[model samples]
Target: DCPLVVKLYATVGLHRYNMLEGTNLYLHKIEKYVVVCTLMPVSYNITLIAEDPATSSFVVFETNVDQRSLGQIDFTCYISRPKGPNQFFDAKDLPDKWPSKEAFADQSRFLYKMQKSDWEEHDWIRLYMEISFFNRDRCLDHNMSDLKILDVVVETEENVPRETVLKSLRNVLVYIRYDQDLADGVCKHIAIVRRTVEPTTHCVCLLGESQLVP
Candidate 1:
């Protein structure tokens, strides 16, 4: 039996891959996770199977998460893809640029609380913006290079009707700023991103029709 927290950590780790690489990899299943370090800050090496929806292919991913306390958490992920029979692509470390120490810790805290109520909404939007900065052409208009989330607010419309539509979604209002140097000053923006939620899977999907609030 896996602890819900640990599973969520795995989900975040996989989401980290999608955020950086711009790949849509779904968490197919979690095979096994073991505590490698049994000290004050416990460490878990989690192995999971992920699917690439494009090719309908499965790959093995191993992620490591260190837990010091409830809110203190960090993760690193490695991926291996099948190439040929008895041959596999080299496993390498995922990018670690997106979530700085503080951001990741905050995300970890949010993830921990999301199981009961909802840290999912905030982090989902935050992560989407970061991903959009890299992948979406629209984000290039601001001449902003890096993503820094200032704040997030879930609109009242989505929050009130908790169980109305089958494809439940939220209107997320986000405040953001880019890298000071990359932007040559302060480049602030307000983004309204529509995020749809699927109760079954662990993969973070593409955002719905989003608009940059002027």
Candidate 2:
């Protein structure tokens, strides 16, 4: 009998990602690549205010939905800035707002891709959110959903390095793939490369797998 070896490749790059196994397929790449992986948040709102304006700033948005009488959970997000009083991106100016919905460890997560240029190119870049409990368009109506907003700080990501985001991580999605010889019980083992971190670092971690199980 011959077992097959597994090699995983990410669209961003190949031979760089490590895979994780769970009867279902799972793989972990590098940091910053997988930016947001939040749980079924108790509340996923942010009171966004720009301390200063910069052409190098950016932000991301996401809202997960279980889609099972779970309150039409799909939602949308937008960011703007203050021009003495206010500034904003017109609907025609924005083409994207939400990242692909995903899943992991038996859970659902929504995602969005925001950036300084795309939606944060102002000093007062602000955040405005809209959610729907039913499959209908419900905009500017805050009293209709259970979504809550959280206070937040703004920053730039124009050329940030991997180490800069290490502190925010606790666990990572690492690749655990190797060769699989069904005929032979031999497989490759993925070794971990551990590193030390100082206090006050932004080390984020990946929780489950990815699949907008939406």
Candidate 3:
């Protein structure tokens, strides 16, 4: 296929995970740095609004990026943690962690990190990323980090399917919640969840006791 249909989603403002096309991938949306994961050289169409009522900065961009080529990415990020009442801490702009123009012009890059957490008395977690992009040719699309884009419209074609591994949940199946809500009573729903580099896939185990308890 000379032209591919690489679908794009969830690249900005408050994480929104929506399963599209039954292709086994979910767009992990967020602030600071939004994430859009795809498994093809092809993609499509959606629009999102960027506005800060407090700051009066409004912009709009379509998500239908037909990733035809390569580009550069500049990135910076932080994690905000609460220490106490109205008190907080910042693990800001990690040393030697931002991207460069020469890099995005070369490979398919992603911003990944393992966050440390104190789950005992946890408050809330917020991930912020400052990323800007530029195409190789000067005078091409030069978006500020806040522009929220991916220069997928490159000038190359591929004969293989793009590989993306889904982050599936791991646990034993006791019972599951198949439906949305309860009718004010108890119920039973058995289920399972798992993932693999092979063909088999799974999800969370269904806990037997508590399907719906009222």
Candidate 4:
């Protein structure tokens, strides 16, 4: 029998797989697992069996969950089956576009690494905007290497119409926070963040931030 921790890891892996592939896989059991202790926190390469809960059928899955330092955990999983003649895994079987929350990290990383010349292009800018705004960390993380924001939209700003702006690009100001420690919820200050994309080089740059007065 696999350790309960290993079984838990299998459950984690299957959940991740379901999100990434947009499939509903319910964990049935852990068939086997191998632990790699070469690293400090240890890693588990798990082979488990799961089922399409809707169909009530079985499929094998393989995954790796690595326990990282600083309370971080990394995991990835895939569907596998034993009936295949020569191969247990095939990359082409997965969806090309990531449609679930599991896809955001990868999507953000991909756009962040676009060639410098292509950053000025419309699609990348819009795509970056959506991911940056929706992902919670873009506003909090000060490290600019991972900060790939093209614009910020304060819920109150009138200069750039949100509808039209969504259709285009330029320097944008976003109200990230409001100071409400006053009477009857009247905000006296707003923390606004601004960023822009260069014309020729087409790289987005942070222009610093400040708390603004009404």
Candidate 5:
């Protein structure tokens, strides 16, 4: 007697565990296209220095909010550069005196006013600097693809158990392939078996599925 076939259903939305399923779920055989989404993190490490007078120091401003949430998070600096005597003095030299209370109130007021101004003027500047620093230090090229994952289902003729099929698919997903032509590019494929049970036929229908990537 053949085992019962199980029918698989593909869905998009929030899953039980608070995980989100993407709206587009391509079948294994379909062509896969890349969906690029850019995430600019809040709180960048900005190194500001005054070099004209030969006194150089850097401060790391932690703007703890996303590009969209920049209005909320105050750009706070955690001094990280220039280890010499100039570090402390140079920071104090700023007319705003951002790191100290005597300067904090005035600086805060300035920032508040700045934030109130048109975001369009300042948003791109902040984003460009953050992305520049991120790419420079990390040796990452922004032109490359962002975080991406492929979703697909593979169908097979073999009468493999669901657990076995899942295991096989996972093995393929974990393997890494190298291509010199594609820098910072990673490709992974996962397969799932769609099953359906038929009472009259006494047979299980197993459909192999995989994600398509373009």
Candidate 6:
């Protein structure tokens, strides 16, 4: 019988392992060089100062820590031009040409065909964000490397049902959390991981028989 805490820890640990492994694969396939960046949102305040409604003075609501009632916050990513003989086209020009939705779709099709032959080799590329929630509102952020296996135990005879090994493992759940800075404010996103186990013919038969028996 796996101890409850050990089972929970293993579930979380495996999720982190898979996510980081996938990120490494993506970095290798998408670009030779990769950079990760983090950003924090800023706050601001507004006040009305004039009866004429033409002019007003704005001041920081609090000065000690630059704390203020802010309007909104947002995020953006910028990529610089690559410099190399292998650089096929300018990033700036491509954006200008593909400004509209139709243009962008057409450009995407063209680019997709350019590497169709080699696409399978790089098909393993993937990106993912892992998040965890503590309470309804609060969340915890932990590094993937920090995930540790806490414990493992066999299910007690009292708790174990008549299900096969693969069927029983499907009950495992994993959780993670991360913070996202948005235009309105900073919000934490919590992700719950549910495992999907492919059923074998034997397992399917067992399920059907169980249904008939009950």
Backbone clashes for every candidate come to: 0, 36, 33, 0, 23, 11
- Per-residue lDDT value at 59 in model 3: 41
lDDT of 6 at 69: 13
Candidate 2 regions exceeding 4 Å error are 1-126, 131-136, 139-141, 149-157, 161-213
TM-scores of all candidate predictions against the true structure: 0.38, 0.15, 0.19, 0.34, 0.16, 0.19
Q: Quick one: RMSD of model 3?
A: 22.7
Q: How well is each residue in 61-171 modelled by candidate 5, as lDDT tens digits?
A: 111111222211112112222223011101111121112344325523211112213223322212222222232324344332332222122223344554343322111
| Candidate 1 positional error at 70, Å | 2.7
The whole-model C-alpha lDDT of candidate 5 against the native structure comes to 0.22
**lDDT of candidate 4 vs native?**
0.41
- Estimate, for each residue in 85-166, the C-alpha lDDT of model 6 and write its tens digit: 1111111111111123453255332111112233223211101122122212222333333322221111111233422211
Reference-based lDDT, each prediction: 0.43, 0.20, 0.22, 0.41, 0.22, 0.21
| Residue-by-residue lDDT tens digits, candidate 1, 31-116 | 88877555553566778888898988898887665443332122223322222211112122322222235643553322111121
In candidate 6, how many Å is residue 142 off? 20
lDDT of 4 by residue, 1-214 (tens): 5454566556656544553355668778887887777656355677888888787889888866544321211222232232221112112221222133453344332112223334344232332232222232323322223323333222212344443443333444333322333336543332333334334332232222233345
lDDT of 3 by residue, 72-97 (tens): 22111111111121211222222221
- Model 3 has a clash total of 33
Name the lDDT value of residue 165 in candidate 3.
15
Q: State in Å the error of residue 70, model 2.
A: 25
lDDT of 6 at 181: 52
What is model 2's C-alpha RMSD? 22.6
